[PDB]
Symmetry: C6
Subunit: 90 residues, 6 copies
């Protein structure tokens, strides 16, 4: 039920973030959010330990990306149920 | 009928803001608004006291966020009814 | 029939602009316009003297906003009827 | 069949532009176009002489606008028909 | 079957680009693409020699535009058929 | 099942990228993605060898483009299935 997010400047980087994330750990990819300014976020759910593993992987592997830039990242272990239908984290 | 808002630059931050807000106090998260340029606002309604507690929590918990940035925040204790049907400050 | 507009960088500020506007004077709020770049405008109609009162209030009260920034503001006392259905001022 | 355009950075300015244009001369306001980055263009059609009078008025009246800024302006006296169905320069 | 494109910062300039393009040569205007950041592209098709003529005209005439700014331009003489329905070049 | 992407600042560049990619090798152009700020990505799928040949060609041919700029590029040889239904990397 944890949520993990990686926000990049650039689309290719966000794809590699996503790929690496789902490969590293037992997490599933649920979201891809654009907010303009080149800022795109990919979002996964899973056990916190796994989501935690997945996010670490994504951040590491983005430096493999020519032009890759990570803007922010975050994990929430136990997100409130109210978030599930306001925010595209589902 | 109070309204609280936190505007961040970055999406993960806005999610923490939201999570923190609804956890800290008895308030309902009613929305999330993009206006471009990375700027996204998370919005809650509740008793002023609870909204004030939600906003304070969200602001202080965003500093935990790697790459998190808070651009603005605001509370209106008693917003005018006119605002509800022009501005996205009732449930989306 | 006057039109008053306040444009801010930031959404919360635009809400406070709106709130203050409708509270100060006999004006009604009709519009909220986004043009990107963080630029959002709120728009009211009413008697010029009131719209005038309302805009003054909104500009004053935005400094109460943590992160508040006013970009522009304007009043038109007697807007042409052609504007009403091209521009979201209605 | 002339076309006149004024592009501003800021929405209130574009409204003044439009107001000024249709007041100064015998022209019709046919649209308003956003392309991002605050950039919004107001567009009119009319006789070249009237369009030229509209645009001049709009530009000079925007300096009245607090925070107003004009980014570009242009007139085409006799625009090619091809433009009408690719570019938003007939009534929106 | 050639494709010619002119990208400006600003809308009025893109209109003058378009106008000049279709006037200079035997080319037809097919596209107007926005990608944000003020960046708008107009797109024509025609014989390469004509498209070539049309693009030269558009670039020259944009300096007539108060506030005119050309960001990029390009011609492809013989674009792959796969481009026609992925990209708004048709 | 490899994926190749080229992200440009500017639309004409992205068209050259695409043209170059599908011409250089046996790959299919599956999309074009805007994320704002001028940033547009062109995306192909194919055998890794062909995708690698497509991307190299596109990058080197964009330097021909007047005003062309490449912001990022990337290839994933064996992308995870999960990506296909969250990210726009199957045909648009």
């Amino acid at each position: 039920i944890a949520v993990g997010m990686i926000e990049t400047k650039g689309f290719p980087a966000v794809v590699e973030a996503a790929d690496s994330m789902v490969k590293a750990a037992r997490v599933t990819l649920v979201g891809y959010e654009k907010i303009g300014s080149g800022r795109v976020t990919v979002i996964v759910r899973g056990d916190v330990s796994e989501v935690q593993a997945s996010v670490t992987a994504g951040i590491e592997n983005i430096r493999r990306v020519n032009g890759g830039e990570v803007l922010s990242n975050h994990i929430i272990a136990r997100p409130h149920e109210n978030l599930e239908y306001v925010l595209p984290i589902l």
